[PDB]
């Protein structure tokens, strides 16, 4: 059917462990540190999208203009494909016109 059969694995999760303990510690970095470095650098994440959060089409546009010459050919053709798709997607057919 569509249910489980027994009670599932017991969710051993310590909500108070170290790798979550400092979650945002030293993360008011800018005005609480005499303006040396903004929070706009403290994020450890991909350089395609580290803090210019536009739309989906914008997301891909930034991915291209940042790292396109660093992809295998499948990713380049893929990013080009969806970029063409989205450029057609924005201004063609929708609810508000």
């Amino acid at each position: 059917i569509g249910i489980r059969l027994t009670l599932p694995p017991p969710k051993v999760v310590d909500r108070w462990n170290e790798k979550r303990a400092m979650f945002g510690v030293y993360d008011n970095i800018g005005i609480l540190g005499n303006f040396e470095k903004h929070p706009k650098e403290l994020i450890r994440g991909p350089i395609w999208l580290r803090g210019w959060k536009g739309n989906e089409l914008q997301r891909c546009i930034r991915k291209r203009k940042m790292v396109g010459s660093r992809m295998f050919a499948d990713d380049l053709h893929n990013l080009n494909k969806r970029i063409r798709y989205l450029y057609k997607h924005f201004n063609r057919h929708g609810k508000f016109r």
Partner: protein
Amino acid sequence: EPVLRKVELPVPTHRRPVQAWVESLRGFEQERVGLADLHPDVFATAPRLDILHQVAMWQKNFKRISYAKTKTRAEVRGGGRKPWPQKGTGRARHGSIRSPLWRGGGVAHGPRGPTSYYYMLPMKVRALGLKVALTVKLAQDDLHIMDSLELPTGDPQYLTELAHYRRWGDSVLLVDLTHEEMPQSIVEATSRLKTFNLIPAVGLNVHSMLKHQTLVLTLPTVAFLEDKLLWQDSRYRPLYPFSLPYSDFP
């Protein structure tokens, strides 16, 4: 002996001084040694829990950038031709065996792209809310501010037994003036504090401000936070980015 740590910035006359006891971790059963104050802008502003929830959101969404993706009507493998005879059978024709209507194809409007939600929102307001949460911890019988975060002992059990003896709370976050100048004994004992934590100067922030049951601020560091909130108080129109030199920046 006594000690009276007033605030350096002149708090206005439209409120009295914001005073409390001054503590220390030196005495294992000897607290309440000295008493001092702070400006109303430091620990006695309006309650303003809404600002605190704003601080909560700007915290919990600050850096997370999820990576979950999918495939579109051209991404997953296969699909260029008409899949089967469109009208010979009684079935349904399609465009592909690789569109999102069949068993294996597309997750049509799923989260495309490793997305991010950074928010460098109003930083002075973030400061005021950080002050607000500090004030909340002040009134909530939680702001036990110590003179200096020295460790009179090396055992973490000394800290645990004092904390149960002080009836501080179930969780503790103690923060100092300088990380290199943080006392070696305090951090060494603190390294096994499985639920308590120690923190440097800039780290006083919102999710941290809810994180423990109570926070233990160092006295000169408390003044440092006051000065920071004071520079947060009445910031003129920025015409240059405040990382470079100014007239009186430090």
